[PDB]
Design a protein around this ligand. Structure first.
Ligand SMILES: *[C@](C)(CO)CCOP(=O)(O)OP(=O)(O)O
Ligand SMILES: *[C@](C)(CO)CCOP(=O)(O)OP(=O)(O)O
Ligand SMILES: [Mg+2]
Ligand SMILES: [Mg+2]
Ligand SMILES: [Mn+2]
Ligand SMILES: [Mn+2]
Lengths: 180, 176
């Protein structure tokens, strides 16, 4: 697996081994983040496995990853949902295409990414992948947004930043409608 | 270091090495939970090191531990405050004396404890033991309670049980 390196603009310049790319001096690369809702409109919240190199054991939104060479960001979203959560989804919607984030995790690992955000509905049961996800919960979005407001330091920083973007937040809200 | 096994009633009946004691089948034993506030009235919330056997990486109340044979609850608290957080504290005060619980962590490790709950104020700066704590936050109790009320899953299960105990919540709410 690899990440796609971006120059000091969002322009691709090559690729780099995933593990080797994420260090204390991570270079800009392409990634995605997705927010998954069940038919009932509940949000799927997940907890990263203790073996994740970056933010292990942290509560975060549904699914994040790294598109590979020749992969649309949307295909990447479909793929990691399958791999991490075993789950089938509706076409991912772009809800924050310009999100960009750089940050250091509790042990020094840096994520530095161009990270378009999507939302989608699940259309199958989950088959959680324990090497990726150690715990999860189906929640009402309102509650989650209330927890993020009260104790943001208890969740991944990128979950908080995306959730507090006004336009992104309105998209999340729309997905709380019950859909059969 | 050990934990103290307790029969149905809270009678000590023997001990076990501390590491060997927490398994998928953890047996009932003695413990404590403690909530610490500084002079400004802020609550210390901590995140357990990734190496802890039970609930590693989980956000929780300030300091928890296992009294040893012959040790008072108040001394255990003082001991673990010093050990985990390098902090001196005022005499621990009772806030939930009959708390008890059993729970299972994401890897299937169980805690099963008689666990009286205390509160105290810090009288020195923290000096962190990263074998025990990987992160922490000084915050307002009120916000922490909102967090616990909104997304209980984001916190340890016993933290949630304690804070939502009507009496214990009133007593913590007075440390600010
Ligand atoms: C950015 C959002 C990291 O915060 C993308 C990384 O997601 P991650 O799940 O860590 O990547 P994978 O390991 O490919 O799933
Ligand atoms: C119960 C509340 C939690 O398992 C008491 C145990 O505290 P813990 O921090 O796990 O014990 P130590 O490892 O002795 O610090
Ligand atoms: Mg991922
Ligand atoms: Mg402890
Ligand atoms: Mn990355
Ligand atoms: Mn124990």
């Amino acid at each position: 697996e690899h990440v796609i390196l971006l120059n000091a603009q969002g322009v691709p310049t090559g690729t780099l081994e995933k593990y080797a790319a994420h260090t204390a001096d991570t270079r800009l690369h392409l990634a995605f983040s997705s927010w998954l809702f069940n038919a009932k409109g509940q949000l799927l919240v997940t907890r990263r496995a203790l073996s994740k190199k970056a933010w292990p054991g942290v509560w975060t939104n549904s699914v994040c990853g790294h598109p590979q060479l020749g992969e649309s960001n949307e295909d990447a979203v479909i793929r990691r949902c399958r791999y991490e959560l075993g789950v089938e989804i509706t076409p991912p919607e772009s809800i924050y295409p310009d999100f960009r984030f750089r940050a250091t995790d509790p042990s020094g690992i840096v994520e530095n990414e161009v990270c378009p955000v999507f939302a989608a509905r699940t259309t199958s049961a989950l088959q959680i992948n324990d090497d990726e996800v150690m715990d999860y919960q189906w929640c009402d979005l309102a509650d989650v947004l209330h927890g993020i407001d009260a104790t943001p330091w208890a969740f991944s920083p990128w979950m908080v930043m995306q959730a507090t973007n006004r336009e992104a937040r309105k998209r999340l809200s729309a997905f709380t409608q019950l859909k059969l």
